[PDB]
């Protein structure tokens, strides 16, 4: 629980000593929080790019498999 007590102390001293390094680090931190909160989808699309290029089953890959089974099963009944 000690980070809750120390965080105000470390953050202000971080801005005092290195205001530009702190603003850049804090600015990038807020930007990703805006991406998650406002559903910009920038971090998700990067994740979807990494999985596609590294051979992982993507979200679209798993949904394509379902659609292939769905069309296969329907014809099996019709």
């Amino acid at each position: 629980p000690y980070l809750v007590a120390f965080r105000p102390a470390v953050l202000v001293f971080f801005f005092i000593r290195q205001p530009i390094g702190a603003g850049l680090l804090a600015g990038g931190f807020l930007f990703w929080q805006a991406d998650r909160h406002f559903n910009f989808g920038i971090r998700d699309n990067i994740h979807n790019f990494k999985q596609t290029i590294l051979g992982f089953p993507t979200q679209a890959s798993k949904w394509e498999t379902f659609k292939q089974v769905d069309a296969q099963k329907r014809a099996q009944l019709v």
């Binding site: 590294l54 051979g55 089953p57 498999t65 379902f66 099996q76």
Partner: protein, 49 residues
């Protein structure tokens, strides 16, 4: 209560603590997730029988 079951942030963001042979395999190697995706696909394929 419904909650996520993700690993701690310090585990997946610390510059040093996130590096290990098995963590790199889990993050960059698709060998594990290819096998486990087969199990999930069998669930929907086997519905018709």
């Amino acid at each position: 209560p419904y909650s996520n079951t993700r690993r701690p942030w310090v585990l997946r963001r610390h510059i040093i603590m996130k590096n290990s042979p098995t963590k790199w395999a889990r993050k960059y190697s698709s060998r594990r997730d290819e096998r486990e995706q087969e199990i999930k696909d069998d669930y929907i394929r086997g519905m018709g029988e």
